[PDB]
Paper text:
The photosynthetic reaction center (RC) of the purple bacterium Cereibacter sphaeroides (recently renamed from Rhodobacter sphaeroides) is a photosensitive membrane pigment-protein complex that serves as a convenient and informative test model for studying the mechanisms of electron transfer, photosynthesis, and pigment-protein interactions. The RC from С. sphaeroides consists of three protein subunits and ten cofactors arranged in two membrane-spanning branches, A and B. The RC contains two bacteriochlorophylls (BChl), PA and PB, combined into a special pair P, two monomeric BChls, BA and BB, two bacteriopheophytins (BPhe), HA and HB, two quinones, a non-heme Fe atom, and a spheroidene molecule. Of the three protein subunits of C. sphaeroides RC, M and L, are pseudosymmetric with respect to each other and have 5 transmembrane α-helices, whereas subunit H has only one transmembrane α-helix, which is mostly located outside the membrane on the cytoplasmic side.
In three mutant forms V(M84)C+G(L278)C, A(L53)C+I(L64)C and G(M19)C+T(L214)C (pairs 1, 2, and 5, respectively), in which the introduced cysteines were close to the protein surface, disulfide bonds were formed regardless of whether these amino acid residues were on the cytoplasmic side or on the periplasmic surface. According to the data obtained, the mutations made for the formation of intra-subunit disulfide bridges (A(L37)C+S(L99)C, A(L172)C+L(L246)C, and A(L53)C+I(L64)C) did not contribute positively to the stabilization of the RC but, on the contrary, had a destabilizing effect on the structure of the complex. However, the cysteine pair L53Cys-L64Cys (pair 2), which formed a disulfide bond, had the least destabilizing effect on the structure of the complex compared with cysteine pairs that did not form S-S bridges.
Author numbering:
A (entry chain M): 1 to 302
B (entry chain H): 11 to 250
C (entry chain L): 1 to 281
The structure:
């Protein structure tokens, strides 16, 4: 049996790594957490420390509030019967205001006002969280890629629950909170609009989602394949190419006639993934605001 | 109609993006060369991108790419046909010569440093607080080559400090000298560490490092390249 | 043409079949025995597909389609125009994809690298065969396989899924989707992290892997490591295609009713099945 580097053979542990300092505010960093021998087989074993400043607490609070708001309604829908709670757990649904209330906030609590409160906490959670992925990178002197990539996923989430409902003039259009309900909402929207396979942006979005799986398989296979040459240390192979980089380049050259660099493969990456939700949110935003029936739109644009 | 303008626009953006990406990926190994290193006539349809420069940390200088490309070492290979596109036979011991799967790159002959500028990789015995914490401790085990002969004992683990992993085994040979063996290229078993890539006789072959408590990016590549090349080149003396 | 570092790697050896006969390059493409196999399978196939698209009578990409044989033919043969060409083009594709794969194993040997890539590749080959071979052969017909058509194959997906209602309700489809979403998530985050390190604020030194680990630990309280994330992204996208094969292999064989009903087994668990309240009781 040849070793394939999928799982660790010998874990070694040193003192806790408390991380680079640069301009990070250390007053706001927690202590190191526990050390999971479990994790260490696949990844790193050290949990913590976490940075938690003002902006993190705001986000970490709003999120719990959005989760709890949904959750209380879920207990209620279960008639406070813990057994029913578990049984119908995927069937509960916090639902948005009925269309007669339009975009207003007047709708009663138990008929949408609760969805609008839970959605507020979500808005504040996600967005202040975005501020976190920026300020953390700024704090270490690094770029804002992580932040711009997030902004792409935010864009779909923003179109589903905010921009399209407002453009469509009513909170009723927006997605409910609940396992099965959100699933049926999806398959519904597809039927209301003429089968989304006829939407060129759904088709595109899918392509990238497939392509993200293809690429990360490709990339992660390749870096494990050349890990016997220190391949996984991509930053220093960028500053100073190695045989790892060379043979990884030359695998895909001799297979498909072209290849990447150790830094280039990560721009392929960041964009294949980011275009998933980028095209994805355009396909939704156009749906019902501009195009009513993708099928019918495809009959006159194709 | 808005939708069709958007989808037409997107496709144009995407071609520009592919172009942008494909050039950005030509910052290394270009421009393409004939088998004698002269510039190649057909360079494909993509232009070299404008040079970018990296500011390496710890006063290690810069890198500017794309730049002059040079192998910066002799290559013991020679043509096997009279026309382009065929293998190139080694002219000595490809293992000793670092050609083929035995190949190494002329990386800087300094060691990689952590973010506080200490050497990234140390032996454990010289790494305060580091110790094995899960799975078999290989230190002390006999190291067996692919010819099923014993070639050395494990006298330390060479560990990455900021990542906290094992990165080499340090093996002591019959003459008392060690070598380093990439961790991803041994199987730590309960009574032995097995090395399928090398046969015992080839263990002294392994390039040797110059300091006992550090290893440079160059010394890594000659050690890793050699072990890996053993896969193809030892095979006359690989059993089962 | 070679790369400014390529020649030293272009040694002989590594082949699985036929020695040094096909052991050469063609441009940047390595050939080998399985480079030839691929080309044959991939060429014969693409030929039969353009000539299947006169038997249908159509020379448009948005219209060319090679449908499987009809359910009536079961699992046997069928005339070329009535399903035979699909059956051939399907064998071709299998040969081409298994050829592309073994060809990759040779390229792996000659480079002294590990076989992780054409092993990852196998999962895609296996999902494909699941849809065109394994699943049709337990349901008893090639007509349960999909057509070879840019838009018709999309039809089949809608037609197939809706046979079982909203296909969302498939529990293995669910787990597939979850890995796929997590993969894109891991891909975005991975690309950006590397990139924000090599490409920091203006005029700054390159950030180190320490700076990556610090960034995530600062942000989510964990950081998986630079070896882990490559292990992850491989596992996440392989997993997703595994449960894709699975979600389809169980569908039409061991489960063939509306997938939404599969979930009663939970709701109808006896310790709470007739408790009043909530949606179900
Ligand atoms: C719109 C719809 C809604 C979507 C909104 C969501 C926003 C998502 C943005 C995605 C960003 C991820 C990419 C990361 C990246 O490389 O950015 C680096 C860089 C980060 O800089 P840094 O972290 O401070 O690091 C400093 C380094 O010097 C910098 O280091 P560096 O080397 O990594 O940075 C260089 C970077 C800098 O690039 C940028 O400034 C980003 C450009 C983003 C373009 C967005 C396009 C969206 C797609 C749809 C387009 C049309 C719709 C139809 O270069 C690029 O990545 C170039 C992009 C390629 C453009 C292709 C042009 C094609 C058109 C031409 C057609 C011709 C064809 C004819 C046939 O990003 C930016 O400069 C900011 C971009 C963020 C955009 C926010 C917009 C919201 C308002
Ligand atoms: C039967 C139903 C319809 C259908 C209806 C829809 C609809 C409607 C939509 C999609 C969407 C998508 N569909 Mg479709 N889809 C169908 C068939 C398919 C098939 C298939 C094999 O048939 C595939 C492969 C896909 C694939 C896809 C994806 C490419 C795309 C979503 C990208 C994404 O990642 O979103 C996942 C990412 C997000 C939702 C963003 C989330 C971002 C926020 C910021 C995260 C917040 C987290 C929160 C704070 C909680 C934190 C958790 C705690 C940490 C624990 N669909 C059929 C045709 N599909 C979307 C799209 O773009 O369509 C154009 C969409 O809206
Ligand atoms: C009406 C639509 C139904 C539905 C019905 C189905 C059906 C039906 C199926 C799926 C399957 C899938 N669906 Mg579903 N699904 C729906 C809703 C969704 C939504 C969503 C947001 O609503 C999402 C995200 C998904 C997601 C997915 C994935 C779990 C999976 C697709 C990946 C896959 O199989 O890869 C596998 C990848 C491959 C098979 C590709 C193999 C590539 C080969 C080996 C190489 C080819 C080379 C090529 C020819 C080269 C050309 C030349 C070169 C380019 C030069 N579905 C709705 C409810 N879903 C599929 C599945 O699980 O299949 C196993 C499937 O069949
Ligand atoms: C390229 C697009 C892909 C992508 C990108 C992406 N997502 C991102 C990022 C990026 C680049 C971030 O920067 C950010 C991040 O930090 O990731 C680590 C994020 C992120 N993507 C997230 C999720 C997410 N991304 C998704 C999708 C994807 N994101 C796309 C496929 C999906 C879906 C629907 O597929 C989900 C569910 C989060 C992990 C994070 C954004 C975090 C956020 O907004 O947090 C605010 C909320 C809180 C701080 C508290 C929330 C309360 C929670 C419910 C937990 C507490 C309750 C309980 C104790 C546990 C709950 C879970 C169950 C066991 C109950
Ligand atoms: C398993 C994880 C993911 C994955 C991985 C993966 N794919 C891979 C690899 C790996 C590891 C490769 O090494 C290999 C490669 O070269 O990648 C660049 C490949 C690859 N995956 C590809 C495609 C692909 N992968 C996909 C998916 C995925 N691939 C998974 C999500 C998808 C989809 C639908 O999501 C597609 C389209 C190719 C780019 C390439 C394989 C190249 C190959 O096999 O070449 C030989 C064959 C030909 C050149 C042509 C053959 C033509 C046929 C004989 C006739 C056509 C038959 C076909 C059935 C008709 C289809 C009709 C459609 C309209 C529906
Ligand atoms: C870190 O490292 C890494 C690199 O390197 C440093 C890399 O390069 C790569 C590779 C990654 C890229 C190049 C990024 C872009 C890749 C994709 C987005 C994947 C999608 C791929 C395509 C759409 C094109 C693939 C083309 C194929 C499959 C073949 C093309 C076919 C021909 C034109 C001829 C086929 C040749 C045959 C039939 C074989 C025999 C040859 C004869 C002619 C005889 C990865 C993963 C990476 O990990
Ligand atoms: C330069 O390097 C880098 C590092 O290192 C230096 C890194 O640290 C990281 C940073 C990465 C991390 C710190 C890890 C965090 C990343 C993620 C959030 C994505 C990966 C997440 C996981 C591995 C855990 C989540 C995985 C899941 C949820 C899949 C398993 C779940 C199921 C099988 C069930 C899910 C289905 C549900 C919920 C319905 C129930 C199903 C029924 C059957 C019913 C990156 C990106 C990096 O690039
Ligand atoms: C155990 O019980 C306790 C009580 C402890 C619990 O906590 C139980 C908790 C639960 C059972 C919760 C389980 C949670 C869920 C099932 C939630 C599932 C969530 C989803 C399926 C997400 C669906 C998609 C949601 C979208 C697309 C949202 C968009 C949000 C908007 C972008 C926000 C827009 C803002 C609005 C509408 C407010 C307007 C006002 C402003 C000021 C901006
Ligand atoms: C996604 C994984 C999340 C892991 C979050 C772990 C945060 C670590 C906090 C540890 C706190 C240490 N201490 C002693 C101050 O409590
Ligand atoms: C995303 C985290 C994944 C954690 C999974 C841990 C899997 C345990 C497998 C370890 C293998 C044990 N052993 C003895 C082979 O080393
Ligand atoms: C913390 C939430 C911030 C306020 C925004 C939420 C709007 C909710 C409206 C509730 C409606 C109350 N009422 C009586 C009209 O039903
Ligand atoms: C960054 C990598 C770029 C890869 C581009 C993927 C091409 C997919 C095109 C599929 C056609 C989709 N559509 C909507 C026109 O039907
Ligand atoms: C975009 C989807 C389909 C694209 C087809 C494959 C692209 C061919 C890339 C191979 C390039 C080989 N070449 C000519 C550069 O030597
Ligand atoms: C769909 C993703 C693949 C797009 C193909 C992009 C072009 C690759 C061809 C690069 C040219 C190779 N060459 C000639 C420079 O060696
Ligand atoms: Fe990587
Ligand atoms: K020690």
């Amino acid at each position: 049996a040849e070793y394939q580097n999928i799982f660790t053979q010998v874990q070694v542990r040193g003192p806790a790594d408390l991380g680079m300092t640069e301009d990070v505010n250390l007053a706001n960093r927690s202590g190191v957490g526990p050390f999971s021998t479990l994790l260490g087989w696949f990844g790193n074993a050290q949990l913590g420390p976490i940075y938690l400043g003002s902006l993190g607490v705001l986000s970490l609070f709003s999120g719990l509030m959005w989760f709890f708001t949904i959750g209380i309604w879920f207990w209620y829908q279960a008639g406070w019967n813990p057994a029913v709670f578990l049984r119908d757990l995927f069937f509960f649904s916090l639902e948005p205001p009925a269309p007669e209330y339009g975009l207003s906030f007047a709708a009663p609590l138990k008929e949408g006002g609760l969805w609008l409160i839970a959605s507020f906490f979500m808005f504040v959670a996600v967005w202040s969280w975005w501020g976190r992925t920026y300020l953390r990178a700024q704090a270490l002197g690094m770029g804002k890629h992580t932040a711009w990539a997030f902004l792409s996923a935010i864009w779909l989430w923003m179109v589903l629950g905010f921009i399209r409902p407002i453009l469509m003039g009513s909170w009723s259009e927006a997605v409910p909170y609940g396992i099965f309900s959100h699933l049926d909402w999806t398959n519904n929207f597809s039927l209301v609009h003429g089968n989304l396979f006829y939407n060129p942006f759904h088709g595109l979005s899918i392509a990238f989602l497939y392509g993200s799986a293809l690429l990360f398989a490709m990339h992660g296979a390749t870096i494990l394949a050349v890990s016997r040459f220190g391949g996984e240390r991509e930053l220093e192979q960028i500053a100073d190419r190695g045989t790892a980089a060379e043979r990884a380049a030359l695998f895909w050259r001799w297979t498909m006639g072209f290849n990447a660099t150790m830094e280039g493969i990560h721009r392929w990456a960041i964009w294949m993934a980011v275009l998933v939700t980028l095209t994805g949110g355009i396909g939704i935003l156009l749906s019902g605001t501009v195009v009513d029936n993708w099928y019918v739109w495809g009959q006159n644009h194709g | 109609d808005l939708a069709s303008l958007a989808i037409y626009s997107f496709w144009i953006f995407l071609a520009g993006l592919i172009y942008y990406l494909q050039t950005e990926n030509m910052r290394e190994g270009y421009p393409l060369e004939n088998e004698d290193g002269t510039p190649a006539a057909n360079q494909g349809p993509f232009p070299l991108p404008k040079p970018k420069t990296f500011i390496l940390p710890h006063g290690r200088g810069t890198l500017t790419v794309p730049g002059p490309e040079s192998e910066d070492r002799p290559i013991a290979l020679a043509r096997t046909a009279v026309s382009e596109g065929f293998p190139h036979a080694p002219t000595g011991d490809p293992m000793k010569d670092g050609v083929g799967p035995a190949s190494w790159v002329a990386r800087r002959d300094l060691p990689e440093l952590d973010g506080h500028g200490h050497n990234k990789i140390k032996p454990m015995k010289a790494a305060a607080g580091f110790h094995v914490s899960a799975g078999k401790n290989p230190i002390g085990l006999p190291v067996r080559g692919c010819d099923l002969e014993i070639a050395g004992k494990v006298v330390d683990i060479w560990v990455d400090i900021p990542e906290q992993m094992a990165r080499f085994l340090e093996v002591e040979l019959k003459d008392g000298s060690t070598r380093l063996l990439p961790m991803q290229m041994v199987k730590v078993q309960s009574n032995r560490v097995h090395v399928n890539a090398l046969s015992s006789d080839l263990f002294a072959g392994i390039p040797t490092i110059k300091s006992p408590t550090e290893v440079t990016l160059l010394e890594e590549d000659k050690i890793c390249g050699y072990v890996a090349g053993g896969l193809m080149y030892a095979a006359p003396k690989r059993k089962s | 043409a070679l790369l400014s570092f390529e020649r030293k790697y272009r040694v002989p050896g590594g082949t699985l079949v036929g020695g040094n006969l096909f052991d050469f390059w063609v441009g940047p493409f390595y050939v080998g025995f399985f480079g030839v196999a691929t080309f044959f399978f991939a060429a014969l196939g693409i030929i039969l597909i353009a000539w299947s698209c006169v038997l249908q009578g159509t020379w448009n990409p948005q219209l060319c389609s090679v449908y499987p044989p009809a359910l009536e033919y079961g699992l046997g043969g069928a005339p070329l125009a009535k399903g035979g060409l699909w059956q051939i083009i399907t064998i071709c594709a299998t040969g081409a994809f298994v050829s592309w794969a073994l060809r990759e194993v040779e390229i792996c040997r000659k480079l002294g690298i590990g076989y992780h890539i054409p092993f990852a590749f196998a999962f895609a080959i296996l999902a494909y065969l699941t849809l065109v071979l394994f699943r049709p052969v337990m349901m008893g017909a090639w007509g349960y396989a999909f057509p070879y058509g840019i838009w018709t194959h999309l039809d089949w997906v809608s037609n197939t899924g809706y046979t079982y209602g909203n296909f969302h309700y498939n529990p293995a489809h669910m787990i597939a989707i979850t890995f796929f979403f997590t993969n894109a998530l891991a891909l975005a985050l991975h690309g950006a992290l590397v990139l924000s390190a090599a490409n920091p604020e203006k005029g700054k030194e390159m950030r180190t892997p320490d700076h990556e680990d610090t960034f995530f630990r600062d942000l989510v309280g964990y950081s998986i490591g630079t070896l882990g994330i490559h292990r992850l992204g491989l596992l996440l996208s392989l997993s997703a295609v595994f449960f894709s094969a699975l979600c389809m292999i169980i569908t039409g064989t061991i489960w063939f009713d509306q997938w939404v009903d599969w979930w009663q087994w939970w709701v109808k668990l006896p310790w709470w099945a007739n408790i009043p309240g909530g949606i179900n009781g």
